[PDB]
Ligand binder design. Structure first.
Ligand code: AG
Ligand code: MG
Ligand code: ZN
Lengths: 473, 157, 97, 150, 49, 128, 54, 127
DNA sequence: GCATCCGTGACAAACCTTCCAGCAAGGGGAAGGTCAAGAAATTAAT
DNA sequence: ATTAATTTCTTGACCTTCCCCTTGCTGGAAGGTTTATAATGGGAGCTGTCACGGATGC
């Protein structure tokens, strides 16, 4: 692949994504650590718990790779399927996507020339809208109250058709127009001559031409089926203290599927209009608190009296997925250590502790011990490392020369706050930094926790030696 | 079990009000007319698991999730030996210049999909089970001697 | 306090932090911008894809370094698809080319 | 299965278990080094499905890794030093091994001997006050001092 | 008891007193913070406090 | 010493002694590098003792205690005496229950013999 | 995908979802986020062969 | 008219009659169109008859053969009388073998009240 | 065409059904694991 | 260029667990259903968070 393509999610696209659907709010069993049938962590919908090990213990150990166990639907494969399996919660009623509802700008009113106050009037079950009427009084996108809906019912009858909530605006977005409204807005943009209108109608017609050119539909903007996050990404894992380690997004998804099951129990039981309109309003508020908790209303709390993380709080600022887990990420072969003074070294030379280079260069130590014949296997070399043999210091001195390593102050001030270094082996438990480059670090010896990152392959090793060594700049 | 743990919480609150000290499971077990292991079992499953965004540190910079151990662990052992032992068997069993390596690679599942017993490897070659058992014992007597399988002997750790 | 392939996480398949938790120091975003200001591409492709991210990538890198082959073998990161499935569960269609 | 605290641990040498008792805990004053096992606390693991190469290895040699798993919390590497106390706690209804029994006996001997010496020196000070009152009132160098203090 | 144990040990005012020195103990007991409920936060403060 | 001729000596099969091994009353035997159970002369004495009671002289709940005190090896000839006094008290309560049952059957089970007179209410009298 | 990392990821991610902004990953952080070689420095000569053979 | 209140009246438990319902012991009652089961008074009479048969010491196969010929106007009481005679004959054979064990064993365990000596003449004579 | 109001950055309590594991005290079927017989393949007389 | 005493191969002939099951309960776990005096506007931050744009109302 060489390009990233984004679009709007179709319900048929989610149905192709699903490979299993969730209908019950159970996550796992409370006595045994196994999820039962059709749950939020289930083996039929998402996949098994361990690598090639089914639910009941009938098919395991690479014998059944692609068959499905008829007892509980488990597909016996690796744990890697638990990070890519989707949702498809069978929603009894369509709901509002709060990312396309309460954003700045909202992008559902600028598609329709409707203010956000009227959007709050229609999505919250308080006011009706009519999609089409027999007379010109009940035109398209008219905002009707419940007394005005009763007046239109006693006045028109079967001529009009005015629903309330997410289904009404869903049918309004689905059956407005596709390109005729775009052509009419394109001709009425330059038909009128103004400035306050030509700063929003051009944005509306650019949004609409993006909708027609990208192959997207306004029906796909609203949410009719909600897919859940993969359960390995929201892991209900037993921690080592006795209790469990869950995510709050699991609690929000359990509340969303609980309100969906309450809606499904309200449809067949012939519910009155107040309770089913409050049920669809609560499903809208639950999916709003699941997507972006700080937009539609009060942030939903938990047991510890804290605002729970939504799908938007998972990607927001420094605490989001981007600046904590995607852009600025923790990395292996990174040693936190203080800075000391090595004045008997060259400009491209730094110090390194023998313990930190022993534990830090462990794959290089094992490879150099296996390639020299001094160690038979990997764990024999590991026992030679753990017992501190005399020869592993010599092989560490052999592997540490002609092998640059990246010294890094946290946080860096500029580009010269991190550069490579060719380390030597000394005693102590700290890094002897060359004194000439501490001004380029702007890191005086105040116990600054410097990370030391190891370039692994020869591409990154020669990139460390020939380009970002301190002898290069 | 929700009803029994609510009754247990009410009995524990009553014994807190009647004693002042922390409620031991013995008094709750004798007042619940239940065995004590069931009381500790329903006490184990006490409450909702700590969510992932609780400030376990001193500030709001590092929440939970940066402290969980991996269940699907990939140790230096579990990453290195799981391929180096496979390469060692592919090097040693290639020296077996007859069908004993061909019936031993499917005896346990090496470089194969489905693990077979002696009967399934028999129908391909040697339908009598004890012939495959005797050639497996001959390969065991060849391999158990510490003369050339010492690199296979060092993998016991 | 150093760290070399021990006690990973379960959420985004990430190395941890702290000495009592045995996790390495965070390679933050400012260090990413400085390493990209050098123009170092292969070190940054290790520091965010095959040293910490890809569970099927860091094991292949470890097996390559143990057998002496220090060749850069990249792949699909196991936390970029975390964001992909997160915004796919959010209700937004996205795929690769 | 519950986690037992025993001494027989697989995949480790006898020199690492040389500073342990039959319960796996170090003796008081054991100069441990970074990397050794301080308490042998193994867990009963589930029967995880093995790779066929390790199955062949189990078929060849006598390496039979049973449900015992080397999950004992070792000493963090780089931290040397001795041990000063080993506090053992247990749940009700659970029996005690010999190490927890000897630590409870050591705590009982401490709370006996320290309180007995406290009561002895307190009795000595109270009888010194009594002797001071007796020599302030009258004087008897034979009836009071030569007679025992009880 | 839930309130007086949530305040004692889990609030922003309650923290680990460094018992390395007596000076640290008597400067942590005579420590006037402004965090927690009612007071300001470290990210939402200015130069006036 | 695989237990097949030993099983012919003790008068049992592999399933019953395997169930005895899986219970908490038989000492763990030796495995001769194949999973087969090996039984020595003391193990043969324990096996003949448990089979000389369970098939001959006792039930499982008492022969288990007998073979548990046999591997002490300090045996007691009066602990087994009070054990069999409690056992004969239990079985004399058992046989007085069965003789009361037999007396009740002979009291409320007599009816007409085989003839053309069906519909006997003796089962209804036993119902109550 | 680089605009969805700075600030207002909700707003610009919705603007990207409703418009169908297919990213060609021409910028330098756009290959940092996807996890491939960057089109800068030593990876520029790799992208010279990547964008020509496409 | 439900099963557990009738079991509490007759002194039985619900698990016993549910195990009888699992096998072919009690005649299956009609479903009351809910999560309960109604009982006929004849079914309650059969239940207390089977309870009286099980409480005195009959095996459940012969008591099942008694209740198969219950609540029906045929009620042949000769072949089932011979079957109960064979049942109590087997019971008396069990009594005979247990009393054979009783007077076989009880003349060997006088001495050795629990000393630490490893010498007993009972086990070496029995085995 | 201008003043003015929200996102967003911030090293209870009983009542009744089905479903499944345990201890009697073990036997049997399915599936996989080791011992004594005759057949291939080697060598010492011409 | 031959074959007769050893040394392997092959084949019945035996030897274990795994699992379902034996009559007879016995207990535990998961799910659904009533109970019938009087019960009718509930509840909870936290601001001592400051300075920007983007949309609303004169
Ligand atoms: Ag004796
Ligand atoms: Mg500093
Ligand atoms: Zn299964």
């Amino acid at each position: 692949f060489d390009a990233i393509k984004i679009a709007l999610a179709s319900p048929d696209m989610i149905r192709s994504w699903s490979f299993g659907e969730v209908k019950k709010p159970e996550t796992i069993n409370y006595r045994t650590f196994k999820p039962e049938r059709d749950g939020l962590f289930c083996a039929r919908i998402f996949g098994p718990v361990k690598d090639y090990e089914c639910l009941c213990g009938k098919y395991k150990r690479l014998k059944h790779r692609g068959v499905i166990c008829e007892k509980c639907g488990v597909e016996v494969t690796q744990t890697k399927v638990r990070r890519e399996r989707m949702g498809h919660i069978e929603l009894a009623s369509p709901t509002a996507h709060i990312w396309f509802l309460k954003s700045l700008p909202s992008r559902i009113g600028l598609l329709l020339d409707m203010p956000l106050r009227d959007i709050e009037r229609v999505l919250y079950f308080e006011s009706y809208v009519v999609i089409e009427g027999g007379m010109t009084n009940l035109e398209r996108q008219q905002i009707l109250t419940e007394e005005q809906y009763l007046d239109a019912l006693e006045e028109f009858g079967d001529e009009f058709d005015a629903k309330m909530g997410a289904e009404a605006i869903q049918a309004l977005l689905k059956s407005m127009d596709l390109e005729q409204e775009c052509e009419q807005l394109r001709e009425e943009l330059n038909e009128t001559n103004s400035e306050t209108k030509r700063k929003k109608l051009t944005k509306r017609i650019k949004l609409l031409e993006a909708f027609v050119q990208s192959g997207n539909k306004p029906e796909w903007m609203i949410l009719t089926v909600l897919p859940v996050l993969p359960p390995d990404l929201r892991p209900l894992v037993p921690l080592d203290g006795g209790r469990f380690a869950t995510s709050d997004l699991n609690d929000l998804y359990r509340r969303v599927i609980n309100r969906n099951n309450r809606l499904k129990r309200l449809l067949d039981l012939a519910a009155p209009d107040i309770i089913v309109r409050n049920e669809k309003r609560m499903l809208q508020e639950a999916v709003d608190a699941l997507l972006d908790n700080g937009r539609r209303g009060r942030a939903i709390t938990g047991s510890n009296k804290r605002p729970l993380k939504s799908l938007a709080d998972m990607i927001k600022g420094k605490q989001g997925r981007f600046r904590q887990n995607l852009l600025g990420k923790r990395v292996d072969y990174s040693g936190r250590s203080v800075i000391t003074v090595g004045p008997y070294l060259r400009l491209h030379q730094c110090g390194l502790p023998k313990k930190m280079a022993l534990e830090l260069f462990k794959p290089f130590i094992y490879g150099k011990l296996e390639l020299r014949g001094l160690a038979t296997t990997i764990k024999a070399a590991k026992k030679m490392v753990e017992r501190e043999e005399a020869v592993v210091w010599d092989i560490l001195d052999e592997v540490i020369r002609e092998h640059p390593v990246l010294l890094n102050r946290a946080p860096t001030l500029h580009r010269l706050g991190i550069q490579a270094f060719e380390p030597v082996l000394i005693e102590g438990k700290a890094i002897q930094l060359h004194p000439l480059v501490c001004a380029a670090y702007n890191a005086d010896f105040d116990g600054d926790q410097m990370a030391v990152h190891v370039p692994l392959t020869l591409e990154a090793q020669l990139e460390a030696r020939a380009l970002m060594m301190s002898t290069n700049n | 079990m929700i009803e029994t743990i609510n009754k247990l919480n009410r009995i524990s609150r009553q014994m807190l009000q009647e004693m002042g000290r922390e409620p031991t499971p013995e008094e709750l077990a004798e007042r619940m007319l239940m065995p004590e292991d069931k009381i500790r079992k329903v006490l184990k499953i006490a409450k909702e698991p700590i969510s992932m965004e609780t400030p376990i540190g001193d500030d709001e910079d590092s929440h939970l999730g940066d402290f969980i151990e991996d269940t699907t662990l990939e140790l230096p052992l579990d990453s290195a030996t799981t391929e180096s032992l496979r390469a060692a068997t592919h090097d040693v069993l290639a020296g077996l210049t007859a069908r004993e390596a061909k019936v031993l690679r499917m005896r346990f599942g090496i470089d194969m999909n489905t693990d077979y017993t002696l009967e399934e490897v028999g129908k391909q070659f040697d339908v009598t089970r004890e012939r495959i058992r005797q050639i497996e014992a001959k390969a065991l007597r060849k391999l158990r001697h510490p003369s050339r399988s010492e690199v296979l002997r060092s993998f016991l750790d | 306090h150093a760290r070399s392939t021990g006690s990973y996480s379960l959420v985004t398949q990430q190395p941890l932090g702290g000495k009592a938790q045995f996790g390495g120091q965070r390679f933050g975003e400012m260090e990413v911008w400085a390493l990209e200001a050098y123009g170092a591409a292969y070190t940054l492709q290790e520091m965010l894809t095959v040293k910490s991210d890809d569970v099927n990538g860091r094991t292949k890198m470890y097996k390559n370094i143990v057998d002496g082959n220090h060749q850069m073998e990249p792949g699909m990161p196991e936390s970029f698809n975390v964001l992909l499935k997160e915004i796919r569960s959010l209700g937004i269609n996205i795929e690769l080319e | 299965g519950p986690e037992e605290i025993t001494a027989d641990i697989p995949n480790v040498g006898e020199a690492a278990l040389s500073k342990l008792d039959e319960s796996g805990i170090v003796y008081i004053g054991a100069e441990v080094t970074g990397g050794d096992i301080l308490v042998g606390k193994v867990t009963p693991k589930g029967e995880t499905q093995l790779t066929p190469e390790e199955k062949l290895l189990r078929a060849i040699f006598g390496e039979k890794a049973s449900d015992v798993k080397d999950s004992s919390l070792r000493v963090p590497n780089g931290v040397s030093g001795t041990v000063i106390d080993v506090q053992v706690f247990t749940r009700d209804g659970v029996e005690k091994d010999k190490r927890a029994l000897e630590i409870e006996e050591m705590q009982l001997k401490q709370a006996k001997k320290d309180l007995s010496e406290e009561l002895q020196i307190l009795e000595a000070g109270l009888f010194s006050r009594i002797r001071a009152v007796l020599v302030a009132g009258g004087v008897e160098a034979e009836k009071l001092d030569k007679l025992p203090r009880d | 008891s839930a309130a007086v144990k949530e305040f004692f040990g889990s609030s922003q005012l309650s923290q680990f007193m460094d018992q390395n020195n007596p000076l640290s103990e008597i400067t942590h007991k005579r420590r006037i913070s402004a965090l927690g409920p009612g007071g300001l936060t470290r990210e939402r403060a200015g130069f006036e406090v | 010493m695989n237990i097949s001729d030993v099983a012919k000596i003790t008068g049992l099969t592999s399933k019953a002694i395997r169930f005895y091994e899986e219970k908490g009353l038989v000492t763990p035997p030796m495995r001769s590098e194949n999973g087969y159970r090996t039984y020595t002369q003391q193990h043969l004495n324990e096996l003949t003792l448990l089979r000389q009671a369970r098939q001959v002289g006792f039930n499982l709940e008492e022969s288990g205690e007998l073979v548990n005190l046999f591997n002490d090896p300090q045996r007691h000839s009066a602990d087994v005496k009070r054990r069999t006094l409690e056992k004969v008290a239990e079985i004399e309560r058992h046989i007085e229950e069965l003789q009361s049952m037999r007396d009740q059957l002979l009291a409320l089970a007599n009816a007409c013999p085989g003839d053309d007179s069906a519909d006997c209410p003796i089962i209804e009298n036993l119902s109550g | 995908i680089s605009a969805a990392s700075f600030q207002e990821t909700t707003r610009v991610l919705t603007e990207a979802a409703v418009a169908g902004k297919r990213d060609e990953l021409r910028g330098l952080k756009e290959n940092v986020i996807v996890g491939r070689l960057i089109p800068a420095g030593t990876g520029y000569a790799y992208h010279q062969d990547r964008m020509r053979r496409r």
